[PDB]
Amino acid sequence: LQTELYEIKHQILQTMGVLSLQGSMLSVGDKVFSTNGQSVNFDTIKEMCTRAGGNIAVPRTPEENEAIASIAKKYNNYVYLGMIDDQTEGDFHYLDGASVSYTNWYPGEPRGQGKEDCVEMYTDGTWNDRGCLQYRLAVCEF
Amino acid sequence: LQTELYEIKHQILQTMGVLSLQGSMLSVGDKVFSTNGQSVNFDTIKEMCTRAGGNIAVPRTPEENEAIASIAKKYNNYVYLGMIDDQTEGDFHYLDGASVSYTNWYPGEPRGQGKEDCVEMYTDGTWNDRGCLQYRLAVCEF
Amino acid sequence: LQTELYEIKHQILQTMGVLSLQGSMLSVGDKVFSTNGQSVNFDTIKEMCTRAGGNIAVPRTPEENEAIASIAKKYNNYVYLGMIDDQTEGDFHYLDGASVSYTNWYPGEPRGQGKEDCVEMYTDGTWNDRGCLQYRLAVCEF
Ligand SMILES: OC[C@H]1O[C@H](O)[C@@H](O)[C@@H](O)[C@@H]1O
Ligand SMILES: OC[C@H]1O[C@H](O)[C@@H](O)[C@@H](O)[C@@H]1O
Ligand SMILES: OC[C@H]1O[C@H](O)[C@@H](O)[C@@H](O)[C@@H]1O
Ligand SMILES: OC[C@H]1O[C@H](O)[C@@H](O)[C@@H](O)[C@@H]1O
Ligand SMILES: OC[C@H]1O[C@H](O)[C@@H](O)[C@@H](O)[C@@H]1O
Ligand SMILES: OC[C@H]1O[C@H](O)[C@@H](O)[C@@H](O)[C@@H]1O
Ligand SMILES: OC[C@H]1O[C@H](O)[C@@H](O)[C@@H](O)[C@@H]1O
Ligand SMILES: OC[C@H]1O[C@H](O)[C@@H](O)[C@@H](O)[C@@H]1O
Ligand SMILES: OC[C@H]1O[C@H](O)[C@@H](O)[C@@H](O)[C@@H]1O
Ligand SMILES: [Ca+2]
Ligand SMILES: [Ca+2]
Ligand SMILES: [Ca+2]
Ligand SMILES: [Ca+2]
Ligand SMILES: [Ca+2]
Ligand SMILES: [Ca+2]
Structure with a gap:
């Protein structure tokens, strides 16, 4: 055995x-x-x-964030992350509905808020709330 | 454990x-x-x-057939399947010798029969009996 | 179970x-x-x-040696192997410190000895002791 x-x-x-x-x-x-x-x-x-x-990937630690950022950097594109604020703005949750804990917002974000329901990761690993209809690098977690 | x-x-x-x-x-x-x-x-x-x-792959359900067809379509080539009629014509068996159950012959096939011992899958997923010496996309099952 | x-x-x-x-x-x-x-x-x-x-790969049987050689041949580059003679020359050991058993030196090797601490595999699978600062195909074993 x-x-x-x-x-x-x-x-x-x-x-x-x-x-x-x-x-x-x-x-x-x-x-x-x-x-x-x-x-x-x-x-x-x-x-x-x-x-x-x-x-769809979502970082929950700095080290997870840096791994996804390195993939964004390699493909030179932003990455959509697994979180949304579709209910009320500023209130971001994971797709299973739990409140977000770890964040890495680019300074000043989240803002611009019309409906920016999704979150994109810039190639330096920082985050921006954004509409959900852009073309972004598909990064998955397993 | x-x-x-x-x-x-x-x-x-x-x-x-x-x-x-x-x-x-x-x-x-x-x-x-x-x-x-x-x-x-x-x-x-x-x-x-x-x-x-x-x-060598052989489909035994419509859903298996469609998966192999999608690979044929992606590579734009026909695919040899894991079955033969080497003994007596029209009598197709899997390579372990069992009689074939699921089939998806292109309308009118199998025919043309001189010795067409093998079976090729067209890119629409339908089948044609064919000689075994053609160059066909290698698709394996595991 | x-x-x-x-x-x-x-x-x-x-x-x-x-x-x-x-x-x-x-x-x-x-x-x-x-x-x-x-x-x-x-x-x-x-x-x-x-x-x-x-x-880093090291062959311990002829069949392992031939597999690494085939990778060297495919990439047309020599391969560094997982062994060194850093202590005293001519005395090659695996990186865990054990004495080397299987060898496949090109005829006349190891020689040239200034400090040739490392071992490279030629594309025919034979070996040459060499300095460690060359650019060689990275082959790993698992
Ligand atoms: O903008 C459309 C976008 O907005 C919503 O908030 C989310 O449910 C997304 O799944 C959807 O695709
Ligand atoms: O398992 C579901 C879970 O998977 C990933 O972590 C992300 O997509 C999360 O937003 C989601 O809640
Ligand atoms: O530059 C910040 C600002 O830029 C654009 O307007 C959009 O991408 C916003 O989501 C973002 O907040
Ligand atoms: O045409 C040659 C071909 O014919 C036979 O029927 C089969 O056994 C194949 O394995 C063989 O390659
Ligand atoms: O395991 C053997 C079996 O494997 C695959 O399904 C096909 O090649 C069959 O024709 C063959 O009988
Ligand atoms: O078009 C049908 C007919 O075409 C060719 O003659 C061959 O590929 C045959 O195997 C096939 O039956
Ligand atoms: O030439 C430098 C080279 O020489 C030593 O013998 C070894 O420890 C290597 O790890 C090192 O990189
Ligand atoms: O596990 C360590 C062992 O791994 C590989 O076999 C080689 O790099 C050896 O030189 C080393 O001693
Ligand atoms: O040709 C043999 C001789 O060639 C060069 O000098 C070096 O690569 C040596 O390591 C090798 O022994
Ligand atoms: Ca917002
Ligand atoms: Ca924003
Ligand atoms: Ca036939
Ligand atoms: Ca036919
Ligand atoms: Ca030496
Ligand atoms: Ca040498």
Whole structure:
């Protein structure tokens, strides 16, 4: 049994290692981030991620934020994050409805507020509330 | 133990998710389809797939058929499938020798019959019996 | 439980199979080799591999040697291997400090010895002791 489990863990390490080495994904602790390289709107990203068995990425620690930023930098595009203020403005929540804890707003944001329901990450890793219809790099977490 | 198994299942989900997201493979239920993008004959495809620990793909449900068709469409080439009528014509079997159940013949096929031992999938997902020496997209199942 | 373990092993086979089929990695027995395609010096390769959860590759059997050689051939570059003679010349050890067993020196090597601390693999799979500051294909094992 333990030899079976050793084998299994080893093979998982190998597959993860190859995907990491080749830049196919980025792991931060127990979270994996990845992109298909496409730039599409918020609803399309959500669909793309859930179809792959994941979720549109959202950073909950500085180290997670920096990993997503590095992907934004690599593709030179902003990234939509997994949070919205669709109910009442300024009140951002994760897509499961929980209130946001970690934030990294660009100085002065969130503002501009007509309806800026979504959040985009600039390539320096800071955040801007934005409408949800822009074409942004699809980044998923697993 | 259960935490160990939770960890293992999570990591498998992550690696599968990254491969899916990036278009490296397509999963239909418990079956995974993938291509190396090469176009080669039937015997070479078989070798290529078994070397990777899989088998030349064969659809057994409409949903499996559509996944392989989508790969054929993406690469704009026909796909050899894992079935033959090498013994007596019109009598198609899977490579393990079992009689074929699900079929999706293009209207009028199978015909043309000299020796058309193999089966190719057109890019609309329908099938044609064909000789085995053509260059066709290598699609494997795992 | 056994169905759970069957599922897990199957999915691992699928992910390994896709990575193999697509040329992302090469498996020899229980060892996986892979490259990010970059050419950098010895210290950088070590870092690159350990960051991915692996180690700079070193062949310990003829079959492992041939797999790394095939990657060197594919990228038309020499490969730094995971061994050094930094202590006293001619005395090569793996990075964990164990004495080297399997070798495949090009005829006449190791020689040229000023300080040739590292080992590079030529594209025919044979070895040359070399300084560690050259740009060589990064090949990792997992
Ligand atoms: O702007 C449209 C956009 O606004 C809403 O707040 C959200 O539910 C999004 O899912 C939707 O796509
Ligand atoms: O699991 C759902 C959860 O997944 C990710 O973390 C993000 O998309 C969140 O906004 C969402 O609440
Ligand atoms: O420059 C800040 C301001 O710029 C634009 O108007 C929009 O992208 C806003 O979301 C943002 O707040
Ligand atoms: O045409 C040659 C072809 O014909 C036979 O029926 C099959 O066994 C194939 O494996 C073989 O490659
Ligand atoms: O496992 C063997 C089996 O694998 C795949 O489904 C196909 O190649 C079949 O034709 C073959 O019988
Ligand atoms: O067009 C139908 C007919 O076309 C060609 O002759 C061949 O590809 C046959 O296998 C096929 O049946
Ligand atoms: O030439 C520099 C080189 O020489 C030493 O022997 C080794 O420890 C290497 O790690 C180092 O990079
Ligand atoms: O696990 C450490 C071990 O990993 C690989 O096999 C090589 O880099 C060796 O030189 C090293 O001793
Ligand atoms: O040709 C053999 C000789 O060539 C060069 O001088 C260097 O690469 C040496 O490491 C090697 O031994
Ligand atoms: Ca707002
Ligand atoms: Ca704003
Ligand atoms: Ca026929
Ligand atoms: Ca025909
Ligand atoms: Ca030497
Ligand atoms: Ca030398």
